[PDB]
Structure 1
């Protein structure tokens, strides 16, 4: 439904999620620290997305339940 607006919102949010940092301005220990930090960040990403999947599954089951009970009226 007006996928142009959805794509624009996606672009804005992704720009909000956009992270551009220095890539050649740190030493080896700092570089490894940044790598570990990015690993932890994407690990939190994996955890949050797993939570999102679980909650979506729960929502879908509840939607099925509510739809069944509202159809049970007649």
Structure 2
């Protein structure tokens, strides 16, 4: 599912135009996926905090 997630770029048998296109396409792919990565990291910090929250209130409810 990751080899699917990555895009198999046409790399070898193209001209300058479509090869630069492949390059910039997958580059902007990496770009927006770093955006989603950092969003997920922020969510992940929030959820870890709320997890410590949950254990705290458990002790408060335990």
Alignment counterpart, residue 45 of structure 1, candidates 28, 33, 52: 33
Q: How far did residue 18 of structure 1 move?
A: 4.4
CA distance in 1, matches of 2:14, 2:51: 51
- Note the aligned Cα RMSD (angstroms): 1.5
Moved over 4 A (4+): none
Q: How far did residue 20 of structure 1 move?
A: 2.3
Alignment correspondent of 2:9: 21
Alignment correspondent of 1:64: 52
Moved more, 18-27 or 42-51: 18-27
TM-score, with length taken from structure 1: 0.71
Q: How far did residue 29 of structure 1 move?
A: 1.4
Residues 21-74 of structure 1: CA deviation (Å, up to 9, x unaligned): 321221101111111111100001100110110010000000011110110124
TM-score, with length taken from structure 2: 0.83
Give the number of aligned pairs: 62
Aligned pair in 2 of structure 1 residues 35, 52: CA closer, same or farther (>3 Å)?
Answer: same
Structure 2 stretches of 5 or more lacking a match? none
